[PDB]
């Protein structure tokens, strides 16, 4: 549990604390092993985990993210319980081994339900068909692979539930001998995570697991990485990053549009990043969480005229060919769509150099929640109406 | 001897417990005691279940039946729709002939409160808040002068009244319009006021009397469920004739009939009939 001397861990000291080299790790074996141990906990197992000496505000933050990790992990617990129940029910009705169940085709079902119907038993035929049909949608062992792995990473990140995973007294098969398991599957899995996924802190932020100050800084760390692997020379001067090339590659961190939007001088076109790729200019905006304050946030056409001809003055770029565009990302997290159109358009990356540079994008499936779908669609307001609505 | 609904004839190989009658296992007093208690509370549990199905409200039953009706095997994800279809529409009104303009809900940032109203409906006079000139005088309430507006506008046989707009006031209006004591009503999202349309029948009004519950704001009357239940009873006959309006802890404006239905007590506002 939490003791005097326990610290919340950063990414670098998590990479330092668990660093172990070993080759053979089943992601899907270990993930489920650790998962299983957490589902075996009772609620008191979450009790003492907050670190003893901290300023009170920071303590409140850690309480928040802990409670959200626990809520997510239980929310997944019951789901997995039901899933496993369905596997067990199929294996009972068919007589097939409980391992193979997940990989079956629909062909195999059309045959099996034919058997079961022709054996006169209708109830378990329909039962089997239901079980299989939902086991098809939610059944893959990788089903939510990324957010699970981020959960476990979060748990490492707190540097408290560490030793909760080992040292249990256990029974056996018909041997039924009582022994003490000294294997810590957690330490294994986290070591594996650090060794494989380098950027996983970036991911952990993209999924909204940073509840305070979230997903902004990790985006610019990400973009800066992307640019550094794209070009041959990168200077970082303060909040501005440039190329030594003589051709235009420029990344500007302008404002934080979260506070600077509600703080002072109510304005329209408040943005986050500016990126100049050569003849293309891109304003990258992170949507505000006020559905009221979004309608302004992306720039007025007059502002785009302005920025365009201002770049034309300064960089000497021809005003004939300039293409200035907007990209506005979801407020609290980052979906696949947004990252694809960040990789593909803003930076120009062909699929193979992206898959090279960012392996984890294939496994990363996150999509917009129903609540958050409409952040993109914005209220159209008339010019004689400007005194009423923002 | 053809049999319908009886499924395979003679069932399947099932003897009764008493008839088959395997030799009775002798349990230690422990086993027997535990059997008695678990099956006693099994019966208790069942009695509970049945009572709960008996007492289920009709709305609950309908939701249940049509929830099961649409149920599929996989819990399917919601489909992405148009930019939105789900904005609550603005209630229709005519711009040219108007008591007040119907103000958009899209302007919700512009609005003020009952105390400090935002400038709107300039072409119309603005109702003033009614406050005491001295100490001994009563402390008026939007409900008090809501009722007296309506009463006086009913005595002069007017079609429309402009009346103070607060939560429980337009609550009171919706309830009266439910019972049909009032032809109609509208809130234009004007800050100060909204409008009520009165109903007359056979030459006099539909409202005999309408009275506020309290004269002050400094006095607040609480209605026990048994009191609101007494009102409903005229010497053994059920009487819904007179309506009493009240607040709930839940901020709902209810008549006394729904209140008695769910057995909640509420704070009194006004009586009308």
């Amino acid at each position: 549990h939490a003791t005097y001397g326990a610290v919340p861990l950063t990414h670098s000291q998590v990479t330092s604390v668990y660093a172990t080299d070993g080759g053979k790790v089943d992601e899907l074996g270990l993930l489920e092993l650790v998962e299983e141990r957490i589902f075996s906990w009772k609620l008191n197992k979450w009790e003492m985990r907050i670190p003893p000496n901290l300023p009170n505000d920071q303590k409140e933050l850690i309480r928040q993210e802990q409670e959200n990790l626990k809520q997510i992990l239980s929310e997944w617990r019951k789901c997995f319980g039901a899933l496993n129940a369905d596997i067990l029910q199929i294996s009972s009705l068919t007589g097939v081994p409980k391992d193979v169940v997940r990989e079956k085709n629909r062909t195999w079902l059309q045959e099996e339900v034919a058997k079961l119907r022709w054996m006169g038993e209708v109830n378990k035929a329909a039962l089997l068909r239901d079980a299989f049909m939902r086991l098809e949608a939610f059944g893959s062992r990788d089903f939510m692979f990324m957010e699970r792995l981020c959960c476990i990473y979060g748990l490492a990140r707190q540097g408290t539930f560490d030793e909760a995973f080992t040292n249990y007294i256990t029974e056996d098969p018909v041997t039924n001998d009582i022994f003490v398991d000294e294997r810590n599957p957690f330490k294994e899995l986290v070591a594996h995570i650090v060794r494989n996924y380098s950027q996983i802190d970036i991911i952990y932020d993209f999924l909204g697991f940073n509840y305070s100050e979230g997903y902004r800084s990790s985006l610019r760390r990400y973009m800066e990485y992307l640019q550094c692997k794209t070009a041959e020379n990168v200077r970082a001067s303060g909040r501005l990053v440039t190329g030594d090339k003589g051709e235009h590659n420029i990344l500007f961190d302008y404002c934080v549009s979260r506070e600077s939007l509600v703080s002072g001088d109510s304005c329209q076109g408040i943005i986050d990043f500016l990126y100049i790729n050569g003849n293309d200019v891109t304003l990258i905006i992170i949507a505000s969480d006020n559905p009221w304050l979004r309608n302004r946030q992306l720039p007025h056409r007059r502002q785009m005229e302005g920025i365009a001809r201002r770049v034309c003055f300064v960089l000497g770029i021809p005003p004939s060919e300039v293409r200035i565009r907007n990209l506005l990302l979801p407020p609290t997290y980052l979906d696949k769509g947004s990252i694809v159109r960040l990789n593909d358009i803003v930076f120009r990356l062909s699929n193979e150099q992206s898959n090279l540079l960012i392996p984890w994008l294939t496994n990363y499936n996150k999509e917009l929640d129903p609540k958050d779908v409409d952040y993109t669609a914005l209220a159209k307001t008339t010019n004689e109406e400007e005194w009423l609505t923002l | 001897a053809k049999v319908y609904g009886a499924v395979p004839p003679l069932g399947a190989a099932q003897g009764h417990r008493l008839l088959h009658g395997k030799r009775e296992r002798e349990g230690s007093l422990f086993a027997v005691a535990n059997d008695v208690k678990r099956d006693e509370r099994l019966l208790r549990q069942q009695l509970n279940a049945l009572l709960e199905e008996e007492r289920m409200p009709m709305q609950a039953r309908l939701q249940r039946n049509e929830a099961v009706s649409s149920h599929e095997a996989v819990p399917q994800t919601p489909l992405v729709d148009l930019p939105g279809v789900e904005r609550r529409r603005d209630l229709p009104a005519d711009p040219i002939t108007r008591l007040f303009f119907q103000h958009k809900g899209d302007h919700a940032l512009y609005y003020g409160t009952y105390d400090k109203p935002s400038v709107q409906d300039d072409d119309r006079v603005q109702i003033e808040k009614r406050v005491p000139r001295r100490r001994e005088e009563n402390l008026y309430t939007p409900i008090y002068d809501f009722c007296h507006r309506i009463r006086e506008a009913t005595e002069q046989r007017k079609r429309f009244v402009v009346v103070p707009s607060t939560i429980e006031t337009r609550g009171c209006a919706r309830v009266m319009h439910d019972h049909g004591l009032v032809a109609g009503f509208r809130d234009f999202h004007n800050d100060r006021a909204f409008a009520v349309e009165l109903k007359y029948f056979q030459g006099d009004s539909t409202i005999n009397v309408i009275e506020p519950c309290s004269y002050d704001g400094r006095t607040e009357f609480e209605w026990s469920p048994k009191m609101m239940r007494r009102l409903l009873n005229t010497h053994g006959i059920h009487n819904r004739l007179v309506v009493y309006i009240c607040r709930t802890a839940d901020n709902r404006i209810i008549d006394h009939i729904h209140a008695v239905k769910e057995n909640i007590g509420g704070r009194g506002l006004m009586m009308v009939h």
């Binding site: 997940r102 629909r106 062909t107 949608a137 893959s140 | 399917q76 489909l79």
Partner: peptide, 30 residues
């Protein structure tokens, strides 16, 4: 309804198709 020899592909193909048919079901409902 598309039956294949691969579980991943059967999975995502059938998810896609099912959603499509749901959309068409909304038009039909209209």
């Amino acid at each position: 309804c598309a039956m294949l020899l691969e579980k991943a592909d059967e999975r995502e193909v059938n998810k896609l198709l099912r959603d499509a048919s749901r959309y068409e079901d909304r038009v039909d409902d209209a």
